[PDB]
Each structure stands twice: as structure tokens, then as C-alpha cells.
UniProtKB/Swiss-Prot annotation, chains A, B:
Location(s), subcellular: Nucleus; Cytoplasm; Melanosome; Cell membrane
Posttranslational modification: ISGylated. S-nitrosylated; negatively regulates the ATPase activity and the activation of eNOS by HSP90AA1.
Comment on protein domains: The TPR repeat-binding motif mediates interaction with TPR repeat-containing proteins like the co-chaperone STUB1.
N6-acetyllysine sites (modified residues): K42, K68
Coiled-coil residue spans: none
Function: Molecular chaperone that promotes the maturation, structural maintenance and proper regulation of specific target proteins involved for instance in cell cycle control and signal transduction. Undergoes a functional cycle that is linked to its ATPase activity which is essential for its chaperone activity. This cycle probably induces conformational changes in the client proteins, thereby causing their activation. Interacts dynamically with various co-chaperones that modulate its substrate recognition, ATPase cycle and chaperone function.
Protein family per UniProt: Belongs to the heat shock protein 90 family.
Subunit structure: Homodimer. Identified in NR3C1/GCR steroid receptor-chaperone complexes formed at least by NR3C1, HSP90AA1 and a variety of proteins containing TPR repeats such as FKBP4, FKBP5, PPID, PPP5C or STIP1. Forms a complex containing HSP90AA1, TSC1 and TSC2; TSC1 is required to recruit TCS2 to the complex. The closed form interacts (via the middle domain and TPR repeat-binding motif) with co-chaperone TSC1 (via C-terminus). Interacts with TOM34. Interacts with TERT; the interaction, together with PTGES3, is required for correct assembly and stabilization of the TERT holoenzyme complex. (Microbial infection) Interacts with herpes simplex virus 1 protein US11; this interaction inhibits TBK1-induced interferon production.
Binding site for ATP: N35, D77, K96, F122
Region ranges (Interaction with NR3C1): 1-207
Residue range from the parent sequence: 17 to 223 of 732
Name assigned to this protein: Heat shock protein HSP 90-alpha
């Protein structure tokens, strides 16, 4: 298990998301579904010139899985997935400029719900989750687990759980007061409101 | 010069865009700027693992160029650009499913401004343009010119104009009654309203 420090700017963003009083927390779901849709778009596009890229699974979809026993909400996609280099370096590099723009927009009167316009919507997970675990598998790379409870550090290890084929599972370990996002009614409401035209099937699992 | 038929579903979409009474035409600009931003995101991401991909130009930006003598508004980006296969086959293949979803959403009460949510925002160009010409250059491929005035066909040829390095120029040959989109005031207004947080510099050229 390897431990890494977030760049100062990302740690600062995560602290803002965790500390700022902001009641409209439900937007985390739209941001993660959007991220899944983007990853699904990428593998779909790649498959048009190299069909063998779908040997790891032809189905392009999103699953939403609540688990009350674990207090987790999991967003699963069969998108392109992420490499070790994405997890350690690439995503953070891209996120630096978006974070700067977002935090400047916030000082100028924008609000947290606009986070996705800056390409850093992933971190909105911290509105509802005390810990986020990400399991991901890219073609021609190993299955990895990324994890962070904020506090300035994240970990990456090779994952030895159930093999996933290709894609990403974002596991939200929900804060004690955020268990409404395990309720079928509440998830259905939020998907209808903010994610109604996503171009891939979204299946909400039942407990 | 090669001439191709649009798929029936795309021709149908273009006819809907051209024929439907819909006053909120200004949204074409947001859709094309969004497309440029996406292409810029792609080359930026690629460059992180292969720096030589920016040998064709390091600057990542968007230019908006009006020309009253030609009655054109040109949207230029230094994004990843498009291949011959993109222009002839790939983009149309992806667009088929999005078109179906969009046209179904329209029958259910959605409006034309939501076109971007279905990944077919490019065709919104036909709200204001009688002809659209696209000049594009991808790394390791030739510079191409795509062109269509709708009517069910488009053309692709190798471009012999000024070499562009890398990226895409979308040239909108404006309809006679749509010359307001050449006015500096009007473009500035529209960019401020719909494209205010794009993560790349947008330069509006003056005539
Ligand atoms: C900036 O930090 C991030 C951002 C993301 C969003 C993100 N980025 C990607 C980049 C390339 C290929 C696939 C994906 C991707 N798939 C999914 N589901 N999210 N996601 C995911 C993430 O997981 C640890 C960290
Ligand atoms: C569906 O039909 C389309 C769609 C587009 C949008 C589009 N698609 C891309 C795909 C891959 C790489 C770059 C781009 C791209 N750059 C830009 N500016 N638009 N654009 C552009 C287009 O130009 C002829 C036709």
C-alpha cells in the first residue's frame, strides 16, 4: 500500500468541500454519474477504431448500489477506467487548474453546485462521504484501489477483490447524517432531477 | 472531393433543426465552444503521457472570429482535432444513438436548447448557418475540410488552405437574417451568459 500527499491546492479544495456550510449536498450524485458517462463515452469512441477494446465487456452502463449494512452507496460504470498513472499523477495535474478556477469563482459569487463546470466534480463526493474508495480497471493495466478520507493523503494499492472486467466503482462511505442517500425514493428523485438524459442505462439496485 | 450521404436519422435531425420554429438560436455558440473545450481537454490529457503530442502547438485556446465581408463566424480551437475516419464514419455512428434520444425527448416536452445533453450539439450550428465548413487537423493525419449545407449530403476533401498545426475551425456561413452574430456586443453577451467558466482562453477578434 502506497501513501501519497495531495497537492496543496487539492487538499485546500477538499477542506473547502468538507468545511463550508452548504445544504444542497445531493448534487454529488449528478457529478459522479457525469464522470461515469464521460468514461463510458471514451471507451465507446475508442472501440469504434479498435473493437478488441470491448473484449473486457461489451455492456456500457451505470449501476447504483446502496448497502445499509456497510453504509455505502456505490456508483459502478463499465467505462474506460483509470491507470495507475491517472490515479497518482495525471488526474491531480489536470485538477490543479480547475481547482484554482473553481475557488476563484466561489470567491466571486459562484456556488458549490457549479463544481462540474471546472472538471473537479469528483471531489463533491466529500459532501456526503467520510471516506471514498475507488476500484478501477483499465485495459492492459492492473485493477487498483484508490482511497482517501481527506486529511491531505490518499493511498493506492493493487486490488485483490472480485475482478471487474473494465471500469470504475466509486464507493462512498457515507457520513452518519447522510444515510438518506441509501433510500430508494431519494436516489430515484435525485436521478430524475439532475441526471435524466444520461445516454447509458442507469440501474438502481434494491436492498 | 468526396460526397457522402448522412444517415437517415442525422438528416432527419438536421431537418428538424432547420425547420422548427425556435427563437432561442443563440445557444449554437455554447454548443460549439463546449465541443472545442472537450477537444482541448482530450489533447491536454494525452499530452500528460506523451509530451510530443504538443509538438503541433503548445497553446490550448479558443478564438472567435467574425468576418462581415464573408458573413462568417469562425470558432477555432487548438484541440485534438478530427481524423478522416471521424469525419466520414465515427462521429456519425456515435451521433445516431444521441439523435434518437434527443428526438424522443423533444416529443416528450424537452426543447432544442437541451441538444448538448445528447452529444449532438454540433448540429445546432444549423440554427444560424446555411452552410457549415469544418477545417480540422489531427496529429499524424492530413488537414481535411468537411462541408455541408444539409439536404442530406456532406463532402470531405484534403484541405490546401493555410496549415493550422492542430485543431478545428468551424466556419459558420450565416443565414441572411442571422448577422447579429457578427456583432462584438452580441457575441460578448452570449459568451458571458452561456460560456463564462470555460477552462481555456476565449479570444473574441475584432473586425
Ligand atoms: C481528479 O480526481 C479524480 C477524478 C475522477 C473522475 C474520473 N476520471 C477519469 C479519467 C480517465 C478515465 C476515467 C475516469 C473516470 N471514470 C470515472 N468513473 N470517474 N473518472 C476519478 C477519480 O478517482 C479516484 C479521481
Ligand atoms: C457529430 O458530428 C460532428 C461533431 C463534431 C464535434 C467534435 N467532435 C470531435 C470528436 C473528436 C475530436 C474532436 C472533436 C471536435 N472538435 C471540435 N471542435 N468539435 N468536435 C464536429 C464535427 O465536425 C464536422 C461533426
Amino acid at each position: 500500500v502506497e501513501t501519497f500527499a495531495f497537492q496543496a491546492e487539492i487538499a485546500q479544495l477538499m477542506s473547502l468541500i468538507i468545511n463550508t456550510f452548504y445544504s444542497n449536498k445531493e448534487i454529488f450524485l449528478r457529478e459522479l454519474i457525469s464522470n461515469s458517462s464521460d468514461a463510458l463515452d471514451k471507451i465507446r469512441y475508442e472501440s469504434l477504431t479498435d473493437p478488441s477494446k470491448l473484449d473486457s465487456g461489451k455492456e456500457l452502463h451505470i449501476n447504483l448500489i446502496p448497502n445499509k449494512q456497510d453504509r455505502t452507496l456505490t456508483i459502478v460504470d463499465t467505462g474506460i477506467g483509470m491507470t495507475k498513472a491517472d490515479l497518482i499523477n495525471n488526474l491531480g495535474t489536470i485538477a490543479k487548474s480547475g481547482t484554482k478556477a473553481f475557488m476563484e469563482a466561489l470567491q466571486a459569487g459562484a456556488d458549490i453546485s457549479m463544481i462540474g463546470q471546472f472538471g473537479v466534480g469528483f471531489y463533491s463526493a466529500y459532501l456526503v462521504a467520510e471516506k471514498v474508495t475507488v476500484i478501477t480497471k483499465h485495459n492492459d493495466d492492473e485493477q487498483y484501489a484508490w482511497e482517501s478520507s481527506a486529511g491531505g493523503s490518499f493511498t493506492v494499492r493493487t486490488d485483490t477483490g472480485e475482478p471487474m472486467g473494465r471500469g470504475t466503482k466509486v464507493i462512498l462511505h457515507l457520513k452518519e447524517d447522510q444515510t438518506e442517500y441509501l433510500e430508494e425514493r431519494r436516489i430515484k428523485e435525485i436521478v430524475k432531477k439532475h441526471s435524466q438524459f444520461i445516454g447509458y442505462p442507469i440501474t438502481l439496485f434494491v436492498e
